[PDB]
Design a protein around this ligand. Sequence first.
Ligand SMILES: Nc1nc2c(ncn2[C@@H]2O[C@H](COP(=O)(O)OP(=O)(O)OP(=O)(O)O)[C@@H](O)[C@H]2O)c(=O)[nH]1
Ligand SMILES: Nc1nc2c(ncn2[C@@H]2O[C@H](COP(=O)(O)OP(=O)(O)OP(=O)(O)O)[C@@H](O)[C@H]2O)c(=O)[nH]1
Lengths: 360, 360
Amino acid sequence: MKALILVGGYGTRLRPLTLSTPKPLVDFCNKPILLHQVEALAAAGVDHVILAVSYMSQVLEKEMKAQEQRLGIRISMSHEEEPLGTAGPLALARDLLSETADPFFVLNSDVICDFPFQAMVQFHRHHGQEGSILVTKVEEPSKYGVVVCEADTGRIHRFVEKPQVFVSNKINAGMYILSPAVLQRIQLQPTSIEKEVFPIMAKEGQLYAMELQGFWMDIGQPKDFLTGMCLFLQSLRQKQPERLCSGPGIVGNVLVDPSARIGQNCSIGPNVSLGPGVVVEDGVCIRRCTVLRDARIRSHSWLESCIVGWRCRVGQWVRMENVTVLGEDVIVNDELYLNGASVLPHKSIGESVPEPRIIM
Amino acid sequence: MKALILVGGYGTRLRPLTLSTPKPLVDFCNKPILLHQVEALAAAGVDHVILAVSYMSQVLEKEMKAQEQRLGIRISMSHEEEPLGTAGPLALARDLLSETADPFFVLNSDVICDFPFQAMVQFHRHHGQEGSILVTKVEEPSKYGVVVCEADTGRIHRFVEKPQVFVSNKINAGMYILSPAVLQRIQLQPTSIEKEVFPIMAKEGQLYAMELQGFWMDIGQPKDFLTGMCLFLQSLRQKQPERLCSGPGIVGNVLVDPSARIGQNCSIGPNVSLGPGVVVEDGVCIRRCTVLRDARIRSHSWLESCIVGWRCRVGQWVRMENVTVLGEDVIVNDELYLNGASVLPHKSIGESVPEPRIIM
Ligand SMILES: Nc1nc2c(ncn2[C@@H]2O[C@H](COP(=O)(O)OP(=O)(O)OP(=O)(O)O)[C@@H](O)[C@H]2O)c(=O)[nH]1
Ligand SMILES: Nc1nc2c(ncn2[C@@H]2O[C@H](COP(=O)(O)OP(=O)(O)OP(=O)(O)O)[C@@H](O)[C@H]2O)c(=O)[nH]1
């Protein structure tokens, strides 16, 4: 099939991470999240996907042009200079996606599940109308478009009603199979697919709703980034137990990259994903954390529920907790305490942050 | 002469403006500050200028090499790959600054003053020694690197100083004359000139001082940028009053580019620097505020002590004050009070913000 991941957004949620690199090139469990979705597409049999680029096209173009030939598929990219939202990508790319009368796949980048492409195309053949979404039921999140669905038919009566769920209990997981007939309904203008097309789509009855098995998380937020990392390591425990590292100083599910290094007398606790090149010295405790490429974590420090970005140097006897995000090349001095520090890139910290702040 | 302007330190201070363009290329009084530097250098009579370019290398050099042909002076660019601090620059360009036994200018990226290049190059020869610095008198020397000198030689005993040094009352204005033998005190490793080379040169007896005559300011902080603005607009009233705009609603020292347009029945207050293309609508009271390029400020707004970045949109009845700095392409919604808001680029604000805060 031909597919489409709209990957151009300014990652304003997940901001210090998405200041250096784009949001799809943020390394999520030792492999970028665009690479997760496009690798699942290549597993599903989609022959062709094109990126819908708006911002930091350089790095995305380079890495994706390499991974094009990495795996046997023709993957081009549609470039936009003015950000047309998440719908204008459809009409910008309508030149090649209005060729045949076959449905195309539109995914958010920031969504990680296990991807039922074949189950949803099996779903989409039944109702035969324009658009299919998949949805996920969680109680507390209402950020996305919360949807109202039918019985095992699945037809959408209503969606996009504002937060005050009241027993709806289904939120759309941002993945669509659209017919090419709705390609002409969208126009070139800066438009959002989530709140412009889909409302009249829902009052027309053309959306249908496949709902998902389990392990879904959107990881556009750093707290949601660590929660999705927890879920993804749980799913890898239930699927590939040999990938998760296992030793005497390893608790729970830990995803150590082979290029990484872990010193002795150090307790890498549960739900940790060390990146390619990290140096965790002798005596560090790390639980629930994400450490990205080339980040050195010096000895006797204690990290819980925090993202440590690229080329960071965390000093000795440092305590970082409560979802602390560090940008690229952030240097924490020794014996400091960071609580909720959102640190921008290229900043050396010599002073504790005892309350959640944006260090700038 | 040869000049060496250090221009590749990341502008961590005055951050939402330097998260998009480099600190040398941010607009200060409608011109990049680096262009103030090299234009007064080319007026004074240096042969060429070496730039030390690390951070946003391509976008800075893409304008610098287009300006060198228009100036009439040559430009070399010592390309920093690791950022070698603020002294490792002239260790990188050692062979360029070692072509002849000659003092060379070393300049900072942030300083703006009446650059006294010829009086400085007259002063450096009389004292004989290896290096001379341009100092300036402050009002209150509370916490900055302060300098204590001699009576008529200016032989500075001690250079760098942590606070409660009250006896000094003189600071480094960021301009240095340097003989090539200082060039063989340096090493290719990353180092600072204020931290280590000037400290041992004030141990030697080579470092000499000569204080300026008014209007010095850095633009490293954003409030320091705003007081430097007017420190410059008071200068443009004192020296070349033709450049400053004057009109019925225009009061005080205002700078307006010819592309900038202003509706009627408004009140542009003193110390305003409207950049190129900016659209000021009806009834918009702008005072003490620099408005960078392509920024639209909608009607009935009030702005005081503020920096509006590139291509921002300020809504109707918005009250922005207290060094509220908007980054590039920040859309402020109507009827909103912003006080202290540092707003990161590509971010829309729907709530008013009463307390000083970074919006990430
Ligand atoms: N190609 C492209 N993709 C876009 C554009 N705007 C949004 N997207 C995509 O929309 C997807 C999901 O939307 P969001 O969850 O709100 O993420 P976002 O674009 O980073 O926006 P924020 O709310 O600021 O985080 C993101 O993965 C983006 O890649 C665009 O203008 N061009
Ligand atoms: N080429 C280069 N120049 C630098 C580097 N670091 C500092 N400089 C220069 O050193 C001079 C003094 O530094 P600062 O005034 O503190 O400016 P800054 O580099 O933006 O750093 P902060 O204001 O502290 O964020 C400036 O002219 C910088 O351009 C560097 O790593 N590479």
